[PDB]
């Protein structure tokens, strides 16, 4: 006829994704990305972090020198992996404040040990027992020196070890608790007395407690493990009359990124910045639901199993009509575009500048959210195997508080980001419509269905001029006004 | 007249509510709902949680078997309620790590106790004291066995109790600290030694400390309470030469939805998921300002006394003018609507579809905020009666940090939700205006007061057609253009 | 001519500021303000808080009565400032739980001490040491009483001190751990022994551990410090056979806005509510990056080095054209305005009401961020000089969690406020444009460049009438319609 229809609209897909917003909880979008990492590879990767596989050893067993842990002497790690199927196979022992010594060594990151010559005179060195078998022979912990009487005497030891280095020295020592008085005399030839280990800054006094304990590996006695840190310029003084499991030297304390994790996952040859007890995970997504226990440049742990961030506009499946009534399922070149009815025929073209503007805004939002990780190393324990009381309750409370707060932040962030993304794509659709209306001026009317009725003869070249912003409204003003406002 | 005026507007109320938004701290709205529960009912509900009223007893007194607490033997609970007017009325005692044992038992949720045939030979069982009167005669704690000499002899005990069950056993035992050497000899016939209670996994050694304490209920001596947890497959060994307040058996350790609260509120016949020290509270609102100490599906504690969530549009009290100049007080059928002046007279009708769309979006937000309360049980202590130091300070810091962060989240959430509520109601008013404008095409002009001037004669049926969305602009186009563009 | 052009637009500046929004990481705005305090004055301000400079003393040395701390006796403070240069010069000692006693006293906020007469009979009072020189004479801690034998006997002490007051009494006492057995006999005339200090509610039993330790200031022995809190109506009972460093009275326990801070900053004559280890800082900004350790009405600590809050509109550098194509670099009277071309030359005038509306919304926003501060006093230790284990790990975890969450809140808040600010200035520009369009009705067309083409001769009086909202579209309707549609 003497008019034409130019409809503006946007693409749609047959199978969209349901996302949450502020306005609604179940709104369909054309595309979305998952922001919660919900699965692991099942293996701990050797790179980029140095992984020390504990095998059958615990970190403390490796520290003390348990005969099965000889392969752990002087090792370094970024993450120590402690296996569930691990056990002591040496003299029964315990550690008051076990969690603290384990934390100290895991944080330090090394078992580097330097032997020192202690003046252990008047006593017999290198005591052994059938509990600790090293090479089919009776042994003891490789980093401890079990001192016993010499010729039925155990003279009081007053042994000085100055710290003349520029680093802190970690000394591991213990106290033997015999299972009977007969053992106390056999090994030390005198009453228990007490052991005092002191520095200029601190002191520790431990008394032996002789008596039977349930046998562990047929041993009715125990060794208690104690430690001390000697600062540069300080002096370690050990005063003992018996029952001393002496240090053979010191371990270095380092500051660093090292930690310990409990995991039965195998260790494999892959590169992954994040490590969890379930194995390494990708750290692209901002959130994870694999484990609360993490090491490295990991995503933050949330309770939500899935959070999907819209990466497209509202999906609205389906004469010509535009964005007000529905989306266009026949558009594959871009997100926004034009469809028209002319004298020559019907056609369609995408508006690639508006499409890219919407994509760049989405890309910017994804860039702020994706690839930004939070690198954490030594942290509190999050899983417990014993009922300890007030301190464990506080550690659980702190972790649950952190998880609830980050889950809230993730839920609010995703709902705000999805509401904003929809608003951005609606704004781009509306800007394209307003641009077209302003370009057409008085030569077209808004039909209320996202289309313009053009009141002058319009060919495909004219539509092309409109689409790329080169339409001259004055050339057609007289025809359009005569048709629009009948005279 | 040859023309008519069709005005669009929205309701207003004589008494609005002041809410906060991001843009303005004090915006008046037609309606708002409180999101902070600031008052309790004053009573603790018997349902749905099992409530154990401690009456005159603390949890530890019920655990030990204080005579006034005999009514709590073998009881179970979901929440143990500890009264301020509670006191011990038995032998004076203390508990190292009292908070840990109280938490441990409260978390377990039961006083179920199984007696065991301990081989307490060579000693006299069931010692009593005048401090503990049961049935008007001298007694002792019902779950403790005060062992004394037999015929002026107290042979060393080496008593083994294997754990052959599939569950952990909690053994409660103590150490008697006589107030004089005469009591130590009178009761045990020998000087004090040490008590060692050990397992394959752990050991505890406690020495008696003879000496006077300020008398409590006329007793100068004290009992210290210790506990041990025996895992399946382990063995309990009690090694003692005197001063042992022996277990009579064990308590079962459970893990579940159980805790302890200090409260003086009465307990009554009601059903409420959330229990606070001030009594049960409703759990419909997302936040509460009653107490930081809660149990069950409770709203999160915030510092704000009030937070009002807008549930309506901004209140703008009042020929005809629309939403740009004011709201309409005289409209009760809906939130959005029309007023007109035509050839027949004045009139008004509400637009019910826009009203419902706004309401549905508000109800969506309300459903997101209301009734989504998260359920928490055993947590940490938040109120303290004694000055303890570093651990109490950390617990207070953790709770204050949590409260400040949730108060921030509540303030930001309400300001964002109220700003969004205003934006949605303004968007619905604007959408109704744009819809009307598009329906009218060139037959009407925007007068800048929220009204359209229609340039053709209108009857009530025509205005109704416009409200319905059935208005045909072509049958009126020639009249409206001849009048609208008259020179 | 027969037509006129009336353009609407907004100002621009030669050089704006880059801020973050939700939509983009770097948007240029005409003005922005810093919300993170990144520097201190270098001095601790004298008021409003009561500041006690520890000089060469620690809080514990001041508590015990170290000779260098006599000037701190019976003092009160809101903030105790502990210097990194502080050192002890008295008998060597330790505290089994040093952090708890230091926190306890710092929280109490006072060294007020009330002497009590204890029945220390049969023993020698006021023992001294060459380690603690007060006036060129051997002395001891001024709040401790080193008891020794009398005539080579130390009878067992059973000393009762009832609490008949209405407040909690803090008793500081200790145990001497001699360096050998000769010291134990020389001082107490008997080996070993045990000290029990008890109340109705609790008891503490400490054994001396005789033996050498590394010499500190030439003293091979140590004193361990213990404390007891006695509630009103309770009794302090001290039972000792030797090695007792007795109390001389009690310290009052209070509850209030008091704490302790470690800092080497000097104390000035400044008045500032917020104190950090680096010195006091302004507390006007909602956030700070000076230190995680704060006292008083301080901004919250964030990791961000800077956060800029837009305080103006987007900066769009600059026939005539309006806001769709460019801003106006030549408009310095307001933020929004009109520029016109008619037969009588060209001109410009600012729209003062839209400018003020945008400013009022921004000032409202600033009042929600600036000044409002959360005041905190005693907290937790955030920096450590020793490797302690599980408790230190938890304290660090809690503080890092708090910082990460507040840094998140600060980034989200600033991005939301900047995106909203941009939306506010775009909305005000669009509202002024729509207002003009509604006033002009059919007498003008929107040219798509932020300007209106008016189809009737619009003189400076017509354009002034339009700018102030007094334009009558009917007066010019016949001319404008004849020029526009014919
Ligand atoms: C205390 O009792 C325990 C257990 O009843 C004794 O330990 C047992 O000793 C025998 C050998 O005498 C072993 O065959 C058992 O396997 C041991 N069992 C356990 C659980 O240790 C212990 O010897 C007793 N102590 C004294 C001093 O008599
Ligand atoms: C140590 O002193 C306390 C308190 O001075 C003595 O306890 C008092 O003993 C008398 C009876 O001898 C009672 O009437 C008082 O009520 C007790 N008071 C308190 C606070 O317990 C205690 O007996 C003394 N001990 C020794 C061994 O002399
Ligand atoms: C135990 O050893 C320490 C250190 O080897 C002895 O302390 C030293 O004593 C001499 C005096 O005899 C002083 O000059 C040194 O400065 C001391 N050194 C330290 C580090 O304190 C201590 O005397 C010895 N104890 C016994 C009982 O022999
Ligand atoms: C979603 O976007 C990704 C690119 O990020 C693309 O590979 C994928 O095919 C898209 N899916 C849909 C349904 O549009
Ligand atoms: C662990 O111990 C078992 C025996 O209990 C042995 O068969 C296995 O090979 C050990 N593993 C390693 C890595 O040494
Ligand atoms: C003790 O054993 C170590 C090796 O662990 C050896 O170097 C040292 O000489 C031995 N000492 C004695 C006294 O046998
Ligand atoms: C401390 O060392 C001295 C000197 O050898 C000794 O006589 C004393 O018994 C030692 N004490 C302890 C507890 O080892
Ligand atoms: C990771 O391991 C924990 C502990 O076994 C388990 O609860 C969790 O479901 C696991 N997650 C995945 C993704 O395997
Ligand atoms: C716009 O499109 C028309 C027809 O497709 C073409 O002739 C014209 O050169 C184009 N202009 C620009 C700037 O791309
Ligand atoms: C606000 O809404 C509630 C229902 O949600 C209603 O009961 C109340 O009367 C309303 N108040 C006003 C002023 O509209
Ligand atoms: C609840 O009790 C606490 C005291 O434990 C009190 O401070 C608070 O104001 C009370 N709240 C209400 C709503 O009664
Ligand atoms: C609790 O103790 C009071 C006396 O203080 C007594 O009157 C009351 O009956 C007791 N209640 C129970 C349940 O034993
Ligand atoms: C001790 O008292 C309990 C109470 O149940 C009783 O069963 C037991 O037989 C008594 N034993 C002796 C030796 O009195
Ligand atoms: C443990 O029992 C044995 C049994 O002979 C005894 O000799 C030993 O002294 C006891 N120890 C304690 C601490 O009771
Ligand atoms: C139009 O609106 C009027 C209002 O009263 C109503 O009665 C009539 O049924 C409506 N018609 C349609 C087709 O919606
Ligand atoms: C920014 O605002 C401040 C007042 O807060 C004003 O003094 C300054 O001149 C403004 N700068 C610009 C470029 O507008
Ligand atoms: C601190 O001690 C030094 C001596 O080491 C002294 O010179 C200085 O004046 C002291 N400072 C104060 C404030 O007393
Ligand atoms: C101990 O010293 C104090 C210091 O104030 C003094 O008042 C008291 O009389 C002295 N007592 C003896 C016995 O020297
Ligand atoms: C407690 O005081 C009495 C007083 O007669 C004394 O005999 C006993 O040894 C004291 N005990 C301690 C631990 O001081
Ligand atoms: C404040 O002091 C800490 C510790 O010395 C330092 O790390 C930080 O950079 C300082 N900040 C400023 C603004 O001086
Ligand atoms: C508006 O401006 C015109 C021309 O400047 C002036 O004559 C008129 O009085 C002004 N009206 C108001 C209300 O300022």
PDB file of C-alpha atoms and ligand atoms in Angstrom, chain A residues 210-212, chain B residues 156-158 194-196 239-241, ligand 14:
ATOM      1  CA  UNK A 210      52.740 -43.858  87.164  1.00  0.00           C
ATOM      2  CA  UNK A 211      49.892 -46.320  86.758  1.00  0.00           C
ATOM      3  CA  UNK A 212      48.289 -48.752  84.390  1.00  0.00           C
TER       4      UNK A 212
ATOM      5  CA  UNK B 156      44.467 -49.324  95.452  1.00  0.00           C
ATOM      6  CA  UNK B 157      41.719 -49.636  92.870  1.00  0.00           C
ATOM      7  CA  UNK B 158      42.492 -50.724  89.298  1.00  0.00           C
ATOM      8  CA  UNK B 194      46.219 -39.143  92.764  1.00  0.00           C
ATOM      9  CA  UNK B 195      43.265 -40.368  90.727  1.00  0.00           C
ATOM     10  CA  UNK B 196      43.859 -41.397  87.124  1.00  0.00           C
ATOM     11  CA  UNK B 239      43.302 -46.108  88.998  1.00  0.00           C
ATOM     12  CA  UNK B 240      42.825 -44.659  92.481  1.00  0.00           C
ATOM     13  CA  UNK B 241      44.160 -44.876  96.037  1.00  0.00           C
TER      14      UNK B 241
HETATM   15  C1  LIG D  14      46.903 -48.078  90.315  1.00  0.00           C
HETATM   16  O1  LIG D  14      46.672 -49.420  90.763  1.00  0.00           O
HETATM   17  C2  LIG D  14      47.872 -50.113  91.150  1.00  0.00           C
HETATM   18  C3  LIG D  14      47.457 -51.512  91.540  1.00  0.00           C
HETATM   19  O2  LIG D  14      48.535 -52.229  92.123  1.00  0.00           O
HETATM   20  C4  LIG D  14      48.564 -49.357  92.286  1.00  0.00           C
HETATM   21  O3  LIG D  14      49.786 -50.008  92.612  1.00  0.00           O
HETATM   22  C5  LIG D  14      48.833 -47.924  91.850  1.00  0.00           C
HETATM   23  O4  LIG D  14      49.426 -47.191  92.916  1.00  0.00           O
HETATM   24  C6  LIG D  14      47.523 -47.269  91.449  1.00  0.00           C
HETATM   25  N1  LIG D  14      47.748 -45.885  91.057  1.00  0.00           N
HETATM   26  C7  LIG D  14      46.912 -44.886  91.363  1.00  0.00           C
HETATM   27  C8  LIG D  14      47.306 -43.527  90.873  1.00  0.00           C
HETATM   28  O5  LIG D  14      45.881 -45.071  92.001  1.00  0.00           O
END
